[PDB]
Structures are given as C-alpha cells and as structure tokens.
Subunit: 330 residues, 4 copies
C-alpha cells in the first residue's frame, strides 16, 4: 500500500476526543451554530445528528469539503446517537419553529415530545457533557431538558437572552455611535414577549444612562428608549417576516456561549437557568439572569439589583413561564 | 439629548471605509461567503446586494444582530449599487444554479445575461476594485466579467479550482491520515467535469506519491487514486443530491481567496485567469492555474510542468471552454 | 533565472501598503507591541525604527524568521524614516525609562528632546497616520507630540490608562471569580501615581459594587478594595523590581488600541487626550478619559459623572501634569 | 463579603484544567513561547516554572496584567512543580544558551545536569503529558528527556528543525516573491550545523525547483541556492551577534507545534524523534524527520526519499549526534 510506503506507523493507540461538540439538528439554526463553532476553532471534533438522513449527510459533506480552511480535524454525522459519544458540549437545535404571528410558547407540546426522545439518547454517550438548549420556547425547554436528563442544574443551560441582550447592545450602539462591545445593557427573563430591559444597569464606561435621563425606558422618555426593547422583542418576527427564519445572530450567540464553556472563561451571560429563591420566586422556573459560564456550565448566578418595577416585570415573566410549565406532562 | 449629555463630539467627519467588501447575491452561497468573511475579520464594512428586497434586508438585519460577536462595524444592503461604493473587493455570487444532473456549462447564457446588468453597476461605484467571480460556469463568467468591466486581467479573478483543490486535499488527507494542510495536490483547468489532477505534483513533505506509485491516477493504478479526482468532480452533484445545493465549502474557499487579496499574502491558489500563450493555448480562455494572489489581484502565474497526459487533459479542458466561449455574444 | 522559469510575471505594479503599521523603538516594549500586533494580524506591513543598527536588524530578522506562522507579508527596518512611509498607525516607544524609585514624570526632558527629532520625521513620511504615544510620561508626551506634529488632536493618542484599567479589571476579576472581560471598572487621569479609580462606575452585569458596599475604595472598607487601586499604581514598580522592566501587558494594551484604530471599531478606551473644557480644567492638559477610538483616532469623549471626591482626584491629577507641562520648552 | 452579596455559588468544585500547558524556563525563549501560546488561545491554564524567584513572579504578573486582552483564564507560576499538575503539554526551555560563536553541542553537559532535576519533577506531576523539548542541543536533550522520563517515544518531542524549515521557507519566499506558506522546503537532521536541506523536495505548487534547475543546492548552481541553507544554519549566530539571543522565531515555531498537539491536527512537522530503523541507523539517535503530530504526540513518520548525497548528509548528522549522545552521563 501507498500509505505504508509513505508513512511508518509508530503508534496504534486509538484515542477519545478531548474537546468534542455535538450539534443536534441541521436546520438553518443548527448549521449557523456549526459553522460559527468551526470558525472559532472551539472543537477537535464536531458531530451532527438529525432524522433526515440525506440532508444530514449533505451538510456534513459540505463542511468536510472546507476542512483545508479549518482547524477541526474530524467532522462526523449520524441519525444514531453513538456518533455523539465523548462530547464536552451538546447543542440542541431540534424541533418545531414558530410561524409569523405564533408564540414560541405555542411550540411547547411538540418540542417536549421531540425532547423526550433526544435528551436520553444524548446524555447516554457523553457523561461529561453540558447541555446547551437553543430550541424554543428555550426557557421552558431548558427546564424540560433538566427534568428529562436528570442532570445537575449547572450542566443544563438555555441560550436564553444572550441574543436579546446582543440585539439590545447593537441597537443601543447604533443610537450612541459606539461599538456594541462598549454599550452595556441587560435583557433578562423570557427569550420572548415577556423579556425585561434592565434600564437601571444600561451604561457606557460605567455611566448610568438612567442617572442622566431618569425617565429612561418609561412612557415619559422624550427619546422613547422603550422602543429599543420593543425592537428587541419584535426582532425574531421582523426577520422571520423578511427572510422566513433567523439563523446568523442566534448561531453567533450560541458560539459565544460555547466559547465560554469550552475555554472555561467564566464570562457573565444572560442565559436560562433555575431562579427559584431569587426575587421571591418560589417555583422551579427557568429564565435568563446573568450567570458565570465555564467548563462545568453555570457555576454561579449574578444577583442583579432590580428596581421594584424591573423586579415586578421579571416576576411577571416568571409567572408567564410557570403557567406554561403547568402544561407539561412527563 | 441623552447622547449629548453622555458624549462630547470632537469630530463629526464621515470617512470612507478602508477595507470594504461587497457580496452581490444573498443566496445560500453569497451568505456563506458573507458569514466566512465576517468570521475572518477581513473587512471594516460589508455590503450586500440582491434583487429580492425583503430577503436582502432580512439577511442584513440577521448579520447586524450578531455585531456584538463580530469586528465588522458596518453591514449594509441595497438593490442600489450606490451601497457598494469604494469596495476594495466585489464578490459576484448572483445567477442561475445547476440542477442535480445538469452541467455548470449549461448555465452560461442565463448568467451572461445577468452579468450584462451587474458588472457595469459594480464598475461605476468601485472602478478600482478587484472583481472575484464565483457564479457558474466560473471560468467563462470571469472572461465575461473581464470583457464587460474593461478592467486589466489582474483584477478579474474566478474562484475556479480553489475549492476542487481543497476537496482533493481533504480526500487525500482522509486516505493518508494526515491533515489536508500537509497533503499537497493540485486540481487545474475547468471548475467542472474537465478538471485536471496534477498527479506529478501530489506530495506529503515533498515526497512525490507518483515516485512511490508510477501508475498513480492512471486506469492501471492498483489503489485507483483516479477515484479521488472522480470524487472531486462529482462533489457538487453528490452534495446537491443530498442537501439540495452546496454553500459551506465554497463560502470558506471564497473567504480564503478574499484573505489573500485583502491581506496581500501572495499565496499561490488554483484560480481562473487568462491562459493564452501557455501549454500551446492560443485563445482568450480563462481557467485555473496556480496564481500568486495579493492586493493587486493576480500578479503572476506559476508554470506547472505537465506530463504529455496532464498537458493533453488541460488542452481538452481549454478546448471544452473555448467551444462554449467562442459562441457567446454580449 | 529560476524565478522566471517557475513564474511568469504579469504585472509590474510597485504596490503601496494598505494597512501599514510602524513601531518606533525596538526595546522590550516596542517588540512586545510588534509581536502582539503581528499575532492579531492587524497589518499587511510592519516597519521598525531605532538608532541602534545591530539591535534593530537582529529584531527585524528574528520576526522575519517567524513569517511562515504569520499573516504579515512584509517586515522591514531602518534608522531612516523613509522605511515608515504611508503608515496608517505609528506607535512611539522610543525614550528613556524610569529606574525603580523614579517617577515617569522625571523622564520628561530626555523624552521631549528625543520626540523633537522623532515626531517631525514620522509626520514627514506618514501624513495620514494616527500617532499612538506609548513612551513616558505618556500624557505629557501626547501633548508634546500633538504640538510638534501639526496633527489634529483626534490623531494624537496616548496609550494612557488602557493598561491601568486592564490591571484594575484583572485584580477585580481575581477577587470575584469572574473573567476581567465581565468586570467593569475605570482608572482615569495620569498613567502614573495620580491615576483615579472611578469606584462609582465599578460593576458586574450593571450591578454597582459601591451600591453593595458603600465603603468601597475608602480606608473604612472591610475588604480594602482601595488596595486594588494601590496595586494598579504600584504595578510597574512591582514588576520592574521583580523582572527589571515591563513589556507583555503594555504590548497587549497597545495592540488593543491598534485593533480599535485599524478596524474602526469605535470601542471606548481610557486613553490620553485633551481634557480642556471638562471638569473645570482651563489648560491644554492631556490625560485619560473614556474615548471612542476608531479609524480617525479619538472622535468623541465620554463625560463620566464623577463623585465630588473622584472629580477632585481627577482635578489633582490634571494639576500634577500641568505643573510639569507648563515648564516645557519646544 | 461583597463577592457573596453579588454572587450566589451553585457548585463549589475542583477546577482541573482540560487544556493545560506548562512552560519551564522564563528566559527570552520561554516567554516568547508563553506569549505566542496565549495569543493563539491554546490553553485554559498556563503555568510557568523557573529557579529565579523574582524573575518568575515578574514575568507571571506581567502576563496576568494582559488577561483582559486574552482568553486563558488562569496564569500561574512556582519554582515548585506542584504548579504544573495535570499539564497536557510541558515545554522545556531551561538551561544554558550559546554565546556568540559557541556551538549548541557545547551546552550538552550543563543542560543534561539540569534535565536530571527537571524531567523527574515534570513526570511526577503530569505522568500523561506530552514533553516538548526546546533547550539545546535539542536533538540530544529529547533523547535525554525520553530516557529520564521513561515515557513512550511518541510523547517526547524536540522542537528540532521546525524553525530551520520555517527559515528556509522564508528565504525561498523572499527569493521567489511568494508567501512562505506557498514555498515548500524541508530541513532535516540536527537543529544546528549538520542540518540537511532536502533539495529534491523543494517546490512551489508541486513544481520541483531541482527539475527546473538540476544544479539546485550544488556548487555548480549559478544562483547559489546552497547559500539559502547556509543562512538557515547561520541564522541563530547572525541574530545572537545582532541582538544577543533569539526569541521571536523559536517562540512562534514552538506555538505552531503546541497547536498541532493541543488541537490534534495531524500536521507534518520536521521534529526530533527516534530514527532507529531508517537510512541505515541502528542506534537510538533522535533528529528531525517529517512527523505526523497530534494529541498523542508523534504517531507516524513520513519516509522521505533522499538522494544518495542527502542520505549521506543525514547519516553524517546522525553520526555527529550519537558520538555526543555517548559523551552523556545520567
Ligand atoms: C423520526 C421523527 N420523530 C419525530 C418526533 C416528533 C416529531 N414532531 C414534529 O414533527 C413536530 C411538529 N412539526 C412542526 O409543526 N414543525 C413546524 C415547522 O417548523 C420548522 C422547523 C424546522 C424547519 C427546517 C428549515 C430551516 O431550518 O430553515 C429547513 O432547513 O428546511 C422548517 C420548519 C417529528 C418526528 S420525525
Ligand atoms: C425525534 C426527533 N429528533 C430530531 C433531531 C433533529 C431534528 N431537526 C430539526 O428539527 C432541525 C430543524 N428545526 C430547527 O432548526 N428548529 C430549531 C429552531 O430553534 C431556534 C432557536 C432560536 C432561534 C432564534 C430566534 C427565535 O427565538 O425565534 C430569534 O430570536 O431570532 C430560532 C430558532 C428533528 C428531530 S425530531
Ligand atoms: C430583477 C431580476 N432580474 C433578473 C434577470 C434575469 C433573471 N434570470 C432568471 O431567473 C432566468 C432563469 N434562471 C434559471 O434557469 N434558474 C435556474 C435555477 O437556479 C437557481 C439559482 C438560485 C436560486 C436561489 C437559491 C438560494 O437562495 O440559495 C434558493 O434556494 O432559492 C435558486 C435557483 C432573473 C432576474 S430577477
Ligand atoms: C440582474 C440581476 N441582479 C441580481 C443580483 C443578485 C441576484 N441573486 C442571486 O442570483 C442569488 C441566488 N443565486 C445564487 O446564489 N447563485 C449562485 C450560485 O453560484 C455558485 C457558485 C459555486 C458553487 C459551488 C459548487 C458548484 O460549483 O456548483 C460546488 O462545486 O460545490 C455553488 C454555487 C440575482 C440577480 S439578477
Ligand atoms: C541618535 C540619537 N539621538 C539622541 C538624542 C537624545 C538621546 N537621549 C537619551 O539617550 C536619553 C538619556 N537616556 C537615559 O537616561 N536612559 C535611562 C534609562 O533608559 C532606558 C531605556 C530603555 C531600556 C531598555 C532597552 C535597552 O536595554 O536598550 C530594551 O532593550 O528594552 C533601558 C534603559 C539619545 C539619542 S540617540
Ligand atoms: C533620537 C532618537 N531616536 C530614537 C529612536 C528609537 C529609540 N529606541 C528606544 O529608545 C528603545 C528603548 N527605549 C524604550 O523602550 N523606552 C520606552 C519605554 O516605554 C514604556 C512605555 C510604557 C510602559 C508601561 C509601564 C510603565 O508605564 O512604566 C507599566 O505601567 O507597566 C513601559 C515603558 C531611541 C531613539 S533616540
Ligand atoms: C535545575 C534547574 N531548573 C531550572 C528551571 C528553569 C531555568 N530557567 C532557565 O534556564 C531560563 C533561562 N535560560 C534559557 O532560556 N535557556 C534556554 C534557551 O533555549 C533555546 C532554545 C532554542 C533556541 C532557538 C535558537 C537556537 O537554537 O539557538 C535558534 O535557532 O534561533 C534558543 C534558545 C533554569 C533551571 S536550572
């Protein structure tokens, strides 16, 4: 053989991948996550899983053809979950998506049914994984993935409001003529219609915008900053109306979270987690609050100081989500 | 105003972008080129152009929303070519695509018609840009864009065989158990069924595979390495059949060329250029040969020593292209 | 020639660089600025300048030998300023450095004299550049460089407190178990002994540390957070005592500024700029305040709401600098 | 505590890093390896070891201070090897370095004595690590480290000719006006005076320079390409004569090797390995040959087909190293 005439093997020792990531679902969101992760050099192996065999194989092949231009030496795929073995991170992007004028909360029964099959199959092969839930409704589905997997809460994370806050900072950046990296502002609660803009923490270089304009984000606001949060809520629906779905911003948001987990950065992200005990919330509600994210998932929660109004709205977001949780049959 | 209570403006000046890239066409190919260019931090401004307004705006907004995760501070879009003013590089991804089982050569007239409108509009707003042609049949469309633009040949580049070569190195690497970066092999001529594998130059660490296997790539080869090239040829068809189209591999291949251009790397890439005078070729045929690629586009061409068999194959590829090319009127 | 047998030249176009950066001074600081800039791929051309012929050539050569691992195709050096022609960014690291126990302010006469020679020569060859002053005392030398150059104030930037702030954030991060990227805090004023910690602005996810601990930064503070600032002020001296000089942190700080400038990011950095007209300062004092940094240098200043105490501290920093500055002759 | 008012901890756990790198020795080379590894985002933990306590603490602090601009969340140091625990890769840059005009082989006994202390300590704390030997004479010290460690040969690697080859490629690139990435040349054998240029493998885009110029690298060669190899051999001497030592190029070469290891790349590098069984070498000689490098270190070796003269030159290099490997007492 040519290979043996060219190369002498000196070590047969087959090995386990050290930094493996799995993406479940090869729809537009799943593939945006995949390409983003590959372009950030986060994994030594990427596995893709779906139920549509041809689409799955075609997606994997297309990525494989780009290997010369990447630094992820192994890209694999299968409808079989054995292909996901030894993953450090499992990203769940499977399920029904909302039509225009349909709530993400309306996806609940359909996506819980899909999760009942995916979750156990996924956890089985990767004892060291963190579960990163992207599928909607993300908050409810992070709670669902937590209850089905039986994982500790630190290991089960929802992409939640990382994208909402990225949109909030883009929009604030645009109004102020400043890069989003230097515009700070938090959108917490549901990754949906009940999200909460934390006006009290909106700042540039530590300067509170609300200290400058105390009416910031109210109906009394001369510059109607509330319209920025309105634009954040309406973002998915405006883009869906235009191109039929969304994929790039979410793929980059998910890759941002994968980077913190894979590199143990311990950076703070507004992501879906269990908030029972915080803000007088006594139920097992999952929703976005600032979390410290690293190699063991969420190791810590940032206790944001909310004004009674921001706190009322966060509790309103938690009540909405709890009501929806009351519909779950396991 | 809040902005004025927060920020003291010291310079109101609206300066020209210095590293601008335009992508014409927001189909799956154009969007893969856009995402890859953004992940590679190649541009300070990205412009998108298409004819379908909602789609175009939606793609732009989706990319805009991921700004927090990027280093490209301005992403714009319009059907109007004024949006492309002062681009350093304009990437053409517009046009008809082949069906599964249809030659790229069969798109010629449809894409020539579209190029008759696109090219003068690009030239009007960026008369000093480098034109990178991706639309199929790439080799013929590069010639057509060169004829329409009136640009010198160095500034009209076709993505050509950059991808065929990346696929060849991926397959070679998978057979040898070596990363494609360390597997060298060139696929030249038409980015199509008449491409030419240069078996004489196929190597690992400067070790000629042909010196180890004199029948390498021939019908008489025991290991049938010619099948690797057949897999390169069938790549697009295979992927179109499974997923419906191709995008990721071409998007990374285009980002690779954009990088050599934007960064003046002077790396060698197998890309579409005029080959009149080489290998006894008399006509204005454009096809892939190893080119030195930098800030002024194609400055030089590497003279590959071809065997009588490889030469004959390239001459036939040149022959197939001119047969279509000669008939054209625009 | 072998080059002509291998390569056919198609274009004899001289080529002018598009993203050229010059580093004046090949001392530990200049070289740490160079390697960081090179590893962030910010330039297509790097030029080095010094007065020690041998040191200059050796450093230039050592960088050149790493070319295969870099994306900067041209590395050049000379004692002649013609080597720096057409730079977009010129980083000044030439000058005397302070001993242990000596103030950066004591370097003023030696460094003003050196700048009288350097600044006109840089300005002669790069009329479009941004001048980035690193040499000490940075705040006074920025003013000196601005007065000599004839450049508008937006294009004369001091590295200032970008380092002091990175140090503050690292220590804050270490205390909190959070990445410095998520620990916000600002050190303004002189890059020196009179720098000002803006406790009122110190926060994690928008949560004011001073709201949780009102005693923050005072002698009354049980956790002695004032010590974080004392460690920031003592940093250079502590590191000089241990290693003989500082280089890695300043090099990364400078490369951070180079990235916002070269890439037109419009990020907010605490860098040296004219403060006349803010905080009741009546003289042409240059010190660090949060600035929007882009392709035209400093376009805007963020007006920080300082507590009376923090403002008095800032005004004392300004007084300290003017004391030195008013005694200058050039 | 302010930390606890701000943060709620979910999980008080053992933070064993997953991608840990140790650099032993904080001289100019060790620090160039450290900066290059940090700027390539290869590790989640960097540990520095040295015998000079103040110099070590100063270097650690200086890097730590640049943390905000990095993605390596923990940088530590100690003279005690407990700090190196659970390293994936341990880089040895400790020992005497050569003076102007002193041979690397002259450092042999001083460094062997140092390796008798270092190697058992590294092994005690990271028994499963890959050992990357940089200290000179690297070929000999890789054999020394292998014998002392008792590690299998795949996990004991010498930086070897990776730098000699990058230099050769830079010089060839400069001569041809092509980026070093597209210029292929291999320098094998000792990283020093007896290194071997493989003229038969020198090429651009699979085009052999020797087929174009049959006298390439010989005395008869009109263009004197043998002078390119002489410059590779003289490089460290020329740079030591100019700047006092070398650092940038080796640091970048070492980070390149660290990248193949950490990311399981399976790239081919000319590195120090046991060559017993090749080219008529019957003894335990370590020297550079092309090696497939990944997560298990060197798993395979490319059998380079050398000319009778190139083979003779390699046997000569092997004879030189074995003669001295016999000068060893440990
Ligand atoms: C083996 C199996 N086991 C189960 C178990 C349960 C279910 N259950 C359901 O099927 C749930 C009901 N389904 C919906 O109502 N879906 C709403 C439509 O939403 C979408 C979602 C994604 C795209 C992809 C799209 C893009 O990503 O852009 C593209 O790429 O084409 C398009 C439309 C099915 C199976 S199949
Ligand atoms: C038994 C079974 N096993 C499997 C295995 C795989 C699959 N495969 C798929 O179903 C793939 C196709 N479907 C999807 O990709 N759906 C996920 C969409 O998730 C999101 C999440 C967030 C956004 C962001 C957006 C918004 O929040 O709306 C905004 O804010 O912009 C958009 C869409 C099906 C099955 S069935
Ligand atoms: C304002 C205008 N001026 C003109 C002038 C001329 C023409 N020219 C023609 O249309 C002539 C007919 N062309 C073909 O025969 N097309 C073959 C099918 O090729 C494709 C190509 C792309 C996709 C898009 C793809 C993606 O977005 O990735 C997806 O999924 O839809 C789908 C099918 C159109 C216009 S519109
Ligand atoms: C007057 C007018 N102005 C405009 C302006 C914009 C648009 N917009 C579009 O046309 C967008 C939709 N169309 C496309 O995206 N088509 C481009 C397809 O190009 C490629 C190239 C290479 C590959 C790689 C592949 C292969 O080579 O097959 C392999 O090898 O894997 C695949 C597809 C239409 C008009 S009409
Ligand atoms: C053609 C010319 N025209 C002029 C005109 C004026 C002046 N003026 C002065 O010379 C000013 C007087 N100098 C001092 O008092 N120096 C105090 C200590 O400064 C340092 C600085 C750096 C290092 C580290 C550095 C290294 O070791 O060199 C490294 O490699 O990192 C060590 C000590 C010189 C020239 S030369
Ligand atoms: C007529 C002439 N033309 C030339 C041309 C070139 C040269 N060449 C040199 O002078 C090179 C050697 N000199 C230096 O490198 N000195 C500048 C050091 O600048 C800094 C800046 C910041 C820090 C950060 C640090 C701190 O602030 O102390 C902290 O906080 O950690 C440390 C040191 C001399 C001449 S003379
Ligand atoms: C018991 C003990 N434990 C310890 C622990 C730590 C330390 N610490 C140090 O010894 C640090 C200071 N010493 C060094 O840094 N020396 C190593 C230099 O290594 C190289 C390697 C390659 C090149 C490349 C170059 C060339 O090959 O020359 C070219 O080709 O450009 C240059 C220099 C001492 C002891 S003693």
């Amino acid at each position: 053989a040519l290979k043996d005439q060219l190369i002498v093997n000196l070590l047969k020792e087959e090995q386990v991948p050290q930094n493996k990531i799995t993406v479940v679902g090869v729809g537009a969101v799943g593939m945006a996550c995949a390409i983003s992760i590959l372009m950030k050099d986060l994994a030594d192996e990427l596995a893709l899983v779906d139920v549509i065999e041809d689409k799955l194989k075609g997606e994997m092949m297309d990525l494989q053809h780009g290997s010369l231009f990447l630094k992820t030496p192994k890209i694999v795929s299968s409808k079989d979950y054995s292909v996901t073995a030894n993953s450090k991170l499992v990203i769940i992007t499977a399920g029904a998506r909302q039509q225009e004028g349909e709530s993400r909360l309306n996806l609940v029964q359909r996506n819980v049914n899909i999760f009942k099959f995916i979750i156990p199959n996924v956890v089985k092969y990767s004892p060291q994984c963190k579960l990163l839930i992207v599928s909607n409704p993300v908050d409810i589905l992070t709670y669902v993935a937590w209850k089905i997997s039986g994982f500790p809460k630190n290991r089960v994370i929802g992409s939640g409001c990382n994208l909402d806050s990225a949109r909030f900072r883009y929009l604030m950046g645009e109004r102020l003529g400043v890069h989003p990296l230097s515009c700070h502002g938090w959108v917490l609660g549901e990754h949906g219609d009940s999200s909460v803009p934390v006006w009290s923490g909106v700042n540039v270089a530590g300067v509170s915008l609300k200290s400058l304009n105390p009416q910031l984000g109210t109906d009394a606001d001369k510059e109607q900053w509330k319209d920025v949060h309105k634009q954040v809520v309406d973002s998915a629906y405006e883009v869906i109306k235009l191109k039929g779905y969304t994929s790039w911003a979410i793929g980059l948001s998910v890759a941002d979270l994968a980077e913190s987990i894979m590199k143990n950065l311990r950076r703070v992200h507004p992501i879906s987690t269990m908030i029972k005990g915080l803000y007088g919330i006594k139920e097992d509600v999952f929703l976005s609050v600032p979390c410290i994210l690293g190699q063991n998932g969420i190791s810590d929660v940032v206790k944001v100081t909310l004004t009674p109004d921001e706190e009322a709205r966060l509790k309103k977001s938690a009540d909405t989500l709890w009501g929806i949780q009351k519909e779950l049959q396991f």
